[PDB]
Structure 1
């Protein structure tokens, strides 16, 4: 009841404000401070009149204590606060070593002992081992300064507390703009970036060598549905690289710089209120830094959103944080800051609402209608639009001037009822051969057919992971057509169904007919027949091939399939080689080192 440490603990207080007051001024300001403590840190504050407690347990109060105290005699406390005074003056060395406090005394210089109470108190607190945080305040009612004396003191202690308690004050946007807006409302189109990636006008000029910094614009020669079913769209594209001088081999990847859907970009401009044809630059406030801009400038908002900015993936923590100020509806602003937080609770609301719902920026704007930022701050915060990679599905020996892509279109419904569209694949799908140009480049990999033709090859490529092997098979067929003896060429393919999603049914059957493909092993899942079982089934034969210097290749979207396939090979070497599992793994390791076990797995 009168035990101050007891009462503080019982009631789960984060912070204690005490006051001693004859005529209500200290009480008033102790209350004003408490109110500000809560408004800014959302603490659970007790604010109590010293007169109502015994203080023998002052040292056991486990929160920070503010003390407001008035002077009334010979530097005495108010007569009602006798018990509080008798404790502070009797306090022996070390008695209050756990007490962390701040203090604001109330006095009047027109009396003999200006602020004697708070001055005495502080001598005794520190003498007994307590640590004061911040300055000792001393209101002067004699000068008429008390309110401003408090104002100054309060601002001070709140800065001290911001570090002591961690955290930031509600009502604060420590928001740092990295770049600055300049509107180029007059400038000629030749100086303005139009969606090209490196040097200005490079999509026009097109001079070798083409690469990541300078992609070749390849015409789309073919674009056909590969699959029988309607659930999914899987497609085969052909990219004309005639006159590029780009060299590739089977096993290489082709990278592609897509465009965002223009309808999406429009919808975005319409909800931001922004006119997107405004050409502009975002110049770095760090004048001496390397990145002068977040993306090629001068450029229009339409262009940045279309070609240089990622607007489809879930925005990150820091972009929610920075957008939160632009939410006029307070409860919408609370959401965003919470989702931007380091809180277990906030992180978790973020994962499900932002990440798991796959909410892109437009979706966040639409569902938080009071969030209305300026386009230029948004463009600064959004991540860069990345290139997208595909396993070339052609051999350069039959298609030297053509690069083939095999891809499933990403198109799916979210928890929140939206339909999301994968950028590159829907873009590629909309490319009609009747010119339609795809910015691209080739990155070399170490995924290669054996250069010694007689060497057997074992390809494991379920689903879209057949991609690289289509080119491997074209190539091997080609080697046979040229008079070379070619070793066995085994494909272990997989899909759901033969009349739904059998990729390259004609071509693989025909390559098999012509003897180019020695074996087409398909594992249609739809009872759960995956490729692992086909490998185990054919284990006896696979071990001969392996022992005969065969090369193994694993391709596909799923890391687990690769892992299951590797495990299956571990068991085959274990059984048929007659060795310990540990030796089996080390054998397959040796293969990898020799370059006879290669992977192309995309996660």
Structure 2
């Protein structure tokens, strides 16, 4: 049932691929690899989520295993794949003696513990007596080489497995794990885009009561945005403040948690995709698993349009592996040839597709000069194109003062193609989707706005009506000290200020209560290092002076602006060296350090910064201080909510 060694044997699998992914990236490649392992060897491969099974019987596995794991927290395994982490990190000496495995670890060198998950996992496996086969792969999203790094590790391991297994090669060739059987009569027992398959007509009374049941990746709660405003005084850039209403359900979130927003690709894009392949969005269809191991991607049956709009991540960078897997369905002989050369030349792919920021469709239109690919099966796509993942946003509202509502401040990703000037702006999906709503919620003449794409605000069967979207809440560790007296140091550049908006709202709804009688019992010094380009992207500028008051002399916000006219750039990490002594004191007083935001280089920087502050302050070596910081990160006094 949920037993590994048992599942593999009963199904006669001769190769087990395991993935421990959080945002589908590892699941994505784990699949590219597993599929290509049947593409050249036709091995019956079981590509499973290291989260659905139980690994007690791991050692009893009779095949060789591929592990695709990503890194989180501080060398942490993706959540809901902790069992695996425990087991592995626990199995004693020679406890996996029979295991033959090879591994690929996705990570981002801009965080400490680069590829820590997989580094650790292979440290234990070793000690557990298992035998690693090829070299240990490290994808580095930091430098944006993930894909090209996978390609490399891939080639290698493919060679190695060829030997170990004495496998004969063959020409590549796609094999569906399902049974694609077109249909005719759209039933209500099927899906038109409903996220989870519980939101099916044949399944809750539209006008019902307080929705229950655990809501999450498997079952998201359709919630309504009850408020939305723009946050930037800018002309180009824009950032949306959204207020979802979760009262209709029993979702109790904490301050510091995250919100997972399930999108639906742009309309201009879903179209560009259906076109190049010459697909009929209406084509109803269904997917039958060819065995208890293959799990159905999404709710089925369904129409092709719904799957391209609600199920398939069509937008985004193109994997060079997807080109190599297309030769089979080339449109014409001249294509099949270029598709090949490209699928083989690291550089040429960059040059002709990657550096130009094409999307699957954009890319293939390019190669064929508009020549349609009526040869690509849908089954192919449903297994060859990544599933759409919800995007996580730091919760900007306080649970204490906004228990029922969830705030989400999300900067819109939407920049000009740096290569093809005449080309459409590189847009993110969930961000603009929120904007289209925000714009439409307020009654703005979108036609006059600079919006880049347009979304089906109605949804499945007007399931998204009243500006709703699928959502759930991820419980995090990002928490404000227990003792309302402990000191607090917050560092959140731009977007990353969100967790501190909560922190303050929260620390205010509190001091408020204590004032309403209970006798306000002190309140530690809270410092917030914010930072943005200028005064047009200054998040919630208007709000801080208000909080500053209710907080007494306990609050203090230091600001830093980078893009400020005639002024030397300045980051929040700079203001730290500026305010070092005060910082150093707050720390010596037990303060808590919170670093949130997008750490392109903000994690290491801010870290290096606090190490500078400490080394200097304690008058010790730079390595010593560094250690000191690591000890805090380990204790929990230095928390990071960076992406």
Q: TM-score range by the shorter chain?
A: 0.5 to 0.7
Aligned residues: 430
CA shift, 1:200, in A, is: 5.4
Distance 1:187 1:225 in 2: 40
The answer on whether the counterparts of 1:392 and 1:471 sit within 8 Å (CA) in structure 2 is yes
List per-residue Cα deviations over 1:5-44 (Å, max 9, x = no partner): xxxxxxxxxxxxxxxxxxxxxxxxxxxxxxxxxxxxxxxx
The answer on whether the counterparts of 1:236 and 1:407 sit within 8 Å (CA) in structure 2 is yes
Q: How does 1:454-465 map to 2 (within 5 A)?
A: 454-465=485-496
The answer on whether the counterparts of 1:212 and 1:441 sit within 8 Å (CA) in structure 2 is yes
Q: Is it true that 1:370 corresponds to 2:371 in the alignment? A: yes
Q: How does 1:271-286 map to 2 (within 5 A)?
A: 271-284=276-289
Q: How does 1:38-77 map to 2 (within 5 A)?
A: none
List per-residue Cα deviations over 1:379-404 (Å, max 9, x = no partner): 33111011100000010001101011
Q: How does 1:298-309 map to 2 (within 5 A)?
A: 298-309=301-312
SS in 1 for 2:326: helix
1:263 aligned to which of 268, 292, 295: 268
In structure 1, what is the equivalent of residue 498 of structure 2? Answer: 467
Deviating more after overlay: 558-567 vs 547-556: 558-567
The answer on whether the counterparts of 2:265 and 2:309 sit within 8 Å (CA) in structure 1 is yes
Distance 1:212 1:175 in 2: 29
List per-residue Cα deviations over 1:266-310 (Å, max 9, x = no partner): 2322332221112101334xx224224333210110110011101
The answer on whether the counterparts of 1:327 and 1:371 sit within 8 Å (CA) in structure 2 is no
CA shift, 1:193, in A, is: 5.0
In structure 2, what is the equivalent of residue 91 of structure 1? Answer: none
SS in 1 for 2:593: strand
The answer on whether the counterparts of 1:315 and 1:382 sit within 8 Å (CA) in structure 2 is no
Distance 2:571 2:256 in 1: 24
Normalised by the length of structure 1, the TM-score is: 0.67
Deviating more after overlay: 555-564 vs 394-403: 555-564
List per-residue Cα deviations over 1:121-171 (Å, max 9, x = no partner): xxxxxxxxxxxxxxxxxxxxxxxxxxxxxxxxxxxxxxxxx99xx9999xx
List per-residue Cα deviations over 1:408-431 (Å, max 9, x = no partner): 111122223232221111111122
SS in 2 for 1:398: helix
The answer on whether the counterparts of 1:458 and 1:491 sit within 8 Å (CA) in structure 2 is yes
Higher RCO, Cα 8 Å, sep 6+:
2
In structure 1, what is the equivalent of residue 607 of structure 2? Answer: 566
Distance 1:375 1:361 in 2: 15
In structure 1, what is the equivalent of residue 510 of structure 2? Answer: 479
Distance 1:274 1:327 in 2: 16
Deviating more after overlay: 459-468 vs 516-525: 516-525
Q: How does 1:74-473 map to 2 (within 5 A)?
A: 174-192=173-191, 194-199=193-198, 201=200, 207-284=212-289, 287-341=290-344, 346-367=345-366, 368=368, 369-372=370-373, 373-374=375-376, 376=378, 377-414=380-417, 415-416=419-420, 417-431=423-437, 432-433=440-441, 435-473=466-504
List per-residue Cα deviations over 1:350-406 (Å, max 9, x = no partner): 233333322111202321223513451333311101110000001000110101111
CA shift, 1:222, in A, is: 1.3
CA shift, 1:569, in A, is: 0.6
Q: Is it true that 1:492 corresponds to 2:529 in the alignment? A: yes
Distance 1:522 1:597 in 2: 21
Distance 1:347 1:215 in 2: 39
CA shift, 1:237, in A, is: 0.6
CA shift, 1:463, in A, is: 1.1
CA shift, 1:486, in A, is: 1.4
CA shift, 1:474, in A, is: 0.5
CA shift, 1:187, in A, is: 4.8
Normalised by the length of structure 2, the TM-score is: 0.63
SS in 2 for 1:520: strand
The answer on whether the counterparts of 2:395 and 2:498 sit within 8 Å (CA) in structure 1 is yes
CA shift, 1:243, in A, is: 2.6
The structure-2 alpha-carbon separation of the partners of 1:496 and 1:197, relative to structure 1 and needing over 3 Å to count, comes to: same
Runs of 5+ consecutive residues of structure 2 not aligned to the other structure: 1-161, 206-210, 443-465, 515-519
CA shift, 1:466, in A, is: 0.6
Distance 1:371 1:173 in 2: 22
The answer on whether the counterparts of 1:453 and 1:479 sit within 8 Å (CA) in structure 2 is no
In structure 2, what is the equivalent of residue 8 of structure 1? Answer: none
Distance 1:466 1:353 in 2: 38
The structure-2 alpha-carbon separation of the partners of 1:421 and 1:215, relative to structure 1 and needing over 3 Å to count, comes to: same
SS in 2 for 1:389: strand
When Rg is computed on C-alpha atoms for both structures, the one with the higher figure is 1
In structure 2, what is the equivalent of residue 520 of structure 1? Answer: 557
Distance 1:481 1:292 in 2: 51
Distance 2:221 2:630 in 1: 38
Deviating more after overlay: 532-541 vs 476-485: 476-485
Distance 1:219 1:355 in 2: 37
Distance 1:167 1:496 in 2: 58
Deviating more after overlay: 370-379 vs 561-570: 370-379
The structure-2 alpha-carbon separation of the partners of 1:335 and 1:204, relative to structure 1 and needing over 3 Å to count, comes to: farther
2:591 aligned to which of 525, 528, 550: 550
RMSD: 2.4
In structure 2, what is the equivalent of residue 586 of structure 1? Answer: 627
The answer on whether the counterparts of 1:398 and 1:474 sit within 8 Å (CA) in structure 2 is yes
The structure-2 alpha-carbon separation of the partners of 1:183 and 1:529, relative to structure 1 and needing over 3 Å to count, comes to: same
Distance 1:314 1:276 in 2: 23
Distance 1:427 1:569 in 2: 37
List per-residue Cα deviations over 1:86-124 (Å, max 9, x = no partner): xxxxxxxxxxxxxxxxxxxxxxxxxxxxxxxxxxxxxxx
CA shift, 1:173, in A, is: 5.0
SS in 2 for 1:217: strand
Distance 1:191 1:320 in 2: 32
SS in 2 for 1:236: strand
Runs of 5+ consecutive residues of structure 1 not aligned to the other structure: 1-161
Distance 2:590 2:258 in 1: 26
Q: Is it true that 1:501 corresponds to 2:537 in the alignment? A: yes
The answer on whether the counterparts of 1:493 and 1:521 sit within 8 Å (CA) in structure 2 is yes
